[PDB]
Each structure stands twice: as C-alpha cells, then as structure tokens.
Write an enzyme that holds these catalytic residues in place. Sequence first.
Site, PDB file in Angstrom:
ATOM      1  CG  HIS A 146      -3.582  31.642 -27.089  1.00 21.30           C
ATOM      2  ND1 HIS A 146      -4.515  30.623 -27.111  1.00 21.30           N
ATOM      3  CD2 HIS A 146      -4.132  32.662 -27.790  1.00 21.30           C
ATOM      4  CE1 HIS A 146      -5.600  31.032 -27.751  1.00 21.30           C
ATOM      5  NE2 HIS A 146      -5.391  32.264 -28.174  1.00 21.30           N
ATOM      6  CG  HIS A 183      -5.744  39.149 -28.247  1.00 17.09           C
ATOM      7  ND1 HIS A 183      -6.720  39.131 -29.216  1.00 17.09           N
ATOM      8  CD2 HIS A 183      -4.555  39.050 -28.907  1.00 17.09           C
ATOM      9  CE1 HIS A 183      -6.143  39.001 -30.405  1.00 17.09           C
ATOM     10  NE2 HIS A 183      -4.828  38.958 -30.251  1.00 17.09           N
ATOM     11  CG  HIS A 211       0.179  39.040 -29.479  1.00 15.20           C
ATOM     12  ND1 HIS A 211       0.046  37.681 -29.653  1.00 15.20           N
ATOM     13  CD2 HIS A 211      -0.905  39.606 -30.070  1.00 15.20           C
ATOM     14  CE1 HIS A 211      -1.065  37.442 -30.336  1.00 15.20           C
ATOM     15  NE2 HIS A 211      -1.660  38.592 -30.605  1.00 15.20           N
ATOM     16  CD  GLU A 225       1.368  38.451 -32.713  1.00 11.59           C
ATOM     17  OE1 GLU A 225       0.261  38.743 -33.206  1.00 11.59           O
ATOM     18  OE2 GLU A 225       1.717  37.285 -32.432  1.00 11.59           O
ATOM     19  CG  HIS A 258      -3.630  42.034 -32.242  1.00 14.84           C
ATOM     20  ND1 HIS A 258      -2.945  40.841 -32.354  1.00 14.84           N
ATOM     21  CD2 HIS A 258      -2.832  42.991 -32.766  1.00 14.84           C
ATOM     22  CE1 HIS A 258      -1.778  41.073 -32.928  1.00 14.84           C
ATOM     23  NE2 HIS A 258      -1.692  42.364 -33.197  1.00 14.84           N
ATOM     24  CB  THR A 275      -0.702  36.655 -35.386  1.00 17.30           C
ATOM     25  OG1 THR A 275      -1.300  36.872 -34.096  1.00 17.30           O
ATOM     26  CG2 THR A 275      -0.849  37.888 -36.262  1.00 17.30           C
ATOM     27  CB  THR A 276      -2.861  32.451 -32.538  1.00 15.22           C
ATOM     28  OG1 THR A 276      -4.191  32.982 -32.617  1.00 15.22           O
ATOM     29  CG2 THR A 276      -2.038  33.361 -31.681  1.00 15.22           C
TER      30      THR A 276
HETATM   31  N1  LIG Z   1     -11.831  28.227 -35.078  1.00 11.92           N
HETATM   32  C1  LIG Z   1     -11.126  29.360 -34.604  1.00 11.92           C
HETATM   33  C2  LIG Z   1     -10.344  29.271 -33.440  1.00 11.92           C
HETATM   34  C3  LIG Z   1      -9.646  30.391 -32.965  1.00 11.92           C
HETATM   35  C4  LIG Z   1      -9.731  31.614 -33.633  1.00 11.92           C
HETATM   36  N2  LIG Z   1      -9.018  32.638 -33.111  1.00 11.92           N
HETATM   37  N3  LIG Z   1      -9.312  33.934 -33.354  1.00 11.92           N
HETATM   38  C5  LIG Z   1      -8.291  34.812 -33.467  1.00 11.92           C
HETATM   39  C6  LIG Z   1      -8.604  36.164 -33.433  1.00 11.92           C
HETATM   40  C7  LIG Z   1      -7.589  37.111 -33.586  1.00 11.92           C
HETATM   41  C8  LIG Z   1      -6.246  36.725 -33.753  1.00 11.92           C
HETATM   42  S1  LIG Z   1      -4.994  37.941 -34.011  1.00 11.92           S
HETATM   43  N4  LIG Z   1      -3.799  37.591 -33.001  1.00 11.92           N
HETATM   44  O1  LIG Z   1      -5.591  39.208 -33.673  1.00 11.92           O
HETATM   45  O2  LIG Z   1      -4.542  37.743 -35.373  1.00 11.92           O
HETATM   46  C9  LIG Z   1      -5.935  35.361 -33.750  1.00 11.92           C
HETATM   47  C10 LIG Z   1      -6.952  34.402 -33.596  1.00 11.92           C
HETATM   48  C11 LIG Z   1     -10.508  31.704 -34.802  1.00 11.92           C
HETATM   49  C12 LIG Z   1     -11.212  30.585 -35.287  1.00 11.92           C
HETATM   50  K   LIG Z   2      -4.317  28.616 -26.054  1.00 19.73           K
HETATM   51 ZN   LIG Z   3      -3.382  38.964 -31.654  1.00 16.86          ZN
END
Ligand SMILES: Nc1ccc(/N=N/c2ccc(S(N)(=O)=O)cc2)cc1
Ligand SMILES: [K+]
Ligand SMILES: [Zn+2]
Length: 257
Positions: free
Chosen positions: A61, A91, A93, A103, A116, A195-196
């Site tokens: 992703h 990471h 987007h 985003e 992010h 956001t994912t």
């Molecule tokens: N169980 C699980 C699986 C995936 C996870 N992902 N961590 C994330 C960390 C940062 C973001 S974001 N795009 O920074 O909101 C989005 C997801 C978090 C917990």
């Molecule tokens: K993925």
């Molecule tokens: Zn992100």
Amino acid sequence: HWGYGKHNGPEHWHKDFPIAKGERQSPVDIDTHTAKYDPSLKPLSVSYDQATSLRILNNGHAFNVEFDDSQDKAVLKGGPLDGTYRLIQFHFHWGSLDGQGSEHTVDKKKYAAELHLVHWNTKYGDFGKAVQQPDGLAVLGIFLKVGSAKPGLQKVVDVLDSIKTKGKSADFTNFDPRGLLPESLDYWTYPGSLTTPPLLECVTWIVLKEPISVSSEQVLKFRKLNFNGEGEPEELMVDNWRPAQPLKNRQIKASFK
Ligand SMILES: Nc1ccc(/N=N/c2ccc(S(N)(=O)=O)cc2)cc1
Ligand SMILES: [K+]
Ligand SMILES: [Zn+2]
Ligand SMILES: [K+]
C-alpha cells in the site's frame, strides 16, 4: 484485500472496518479560517538526532522506513501532546499526477504527496498496546509540493528500485529523517484516526503548515513502485490516499497566529 482500486478502495473499507464511518476519522480538510489559534499549546519538540532506521519495506500500500524503537531516541513531544511519543516508521501517500496525492487538504487544496511520521505514546509500552488507546499515536504530517529537489529525500528515492513490489524489503540504516522537515514547525492539530485499515481512532494529528518541495523526478520514482508482488500483473503504486472524511464533532487548532 483492501486497497485503492474501484472494488476495494476507500468507499468499500467500511464493510470490513465499520469504524470507517466513525466519529473521528482521518484525513480531513483543514479550513484555515475556521481553525483557531490555541495559546494552550506548548512548544512542539521534534528530537530526531538519535533516530536509527533499520529497513525499508514495500507493504503493498506504500513503503515504510522503519526505525529501531527499542530505546528512547527519536521523540515527538510538546504541542498538543501529553508526555513523549516515539518514532516507529514513516511513509508517504502520493498521486498519479502532481495535482493530487495528499490525504489532508488545506482549504480543499490537494498537495502532490504527504509524509506521515508515525509515533507511539511511550506510556503504553509499545505500538501494539498504543493502538488500543484514544491517545496512543501521534502522526506528524508534512505536505510535499513539486518544485526544487529535497536533497534529504534522495537516499529513499534511490533504494526504491530494490523494493519495487509488494513484500520486498531492504536494509536501510543511517537514514536521518531530519532531512525531510521544513523550516517552520507551525501546525494544525486535531484528534483523528489511522488513514488506512484498521482505521483505528488513536491518533493526535499534527499537520505542518509549510510544505517541503521535492522534484518532479523524485515523485516520479515513487510512481514506479508497484502495488502487486513480483511476477504479478503490474499495477503502479499511485493514488494511495484516502480522501477527506467528515469533521463531525471536531475542532482544528492552530499553533500560530
Ligand atoms: N493491527 C494494525 C495493522 C496496521 C496498522 N497500521 N498502522 C498505521 C500507521 C499509520 C497510518 S497513517 N496513514 O499514518 O494514518 C496508518 C496505519 C496498525 C495496527
Ligand atoms: K497493504
Ligand atoms: Zn499515512
Ligand atoms: K486500478
């Protein structure tokens, strides 16, 4: 099998992840006129001098630059935050075109990409416990516009050729995330979510007002990544952004007058 396509993209996520329609989802549009300066915000402190990167990973992703978060090093504190938050990964987007990719939006303006930097609240011991808490995470968001190159980004750009496809990872030590930060730490802040998927409502968002500039050539290299794995039909990793979600019962606060 969530993703960003027609049959698995953001408008489908709520089926497996009903919190997608929750009360504090991210990203949001930042209406700059409605955001209020908050004198209660303490100075924001970004202390990345001892950050120790380990690896870079294409997770299908985006790509994540991971950090060794076993010691108290790369920390975010101050601003809206109570206590100390430790950097675990960053990471981006980005879009298929320079006109989209972020985003968060600013008065409906979309930037070319968004960085992010993800941190967990040390009061909860690790990331996994932190994502069970309403104040478990702080994400520092930084907009990217296309213009001058960002020299501190080039090391990331150059390693992307080795992680083209989903599941590929590479050693990525000694990367300094200080090279990705704009001059000003002026920011907006609000309570939101990942956001994912799993879209968990754990995040204090801190979105910097000043974008960084990256070159067209740099972002073009992001767009050569693949969502698919090795040997699979090529689907370019582009437009891996969730659109703005309803603000609902929230206020966005500004750190600046
Ligand atoms: N169980 C699980 C699986 C995936 C996870 N992902 N961590 C994330 C960390 C940062 C973001 S974001 N795009 O920074 O909101 C989005 C997801 C978090 C917990
Ligand atoms: K993925
Ligand atoms: Zn992100
Ligand atoms: K597609």
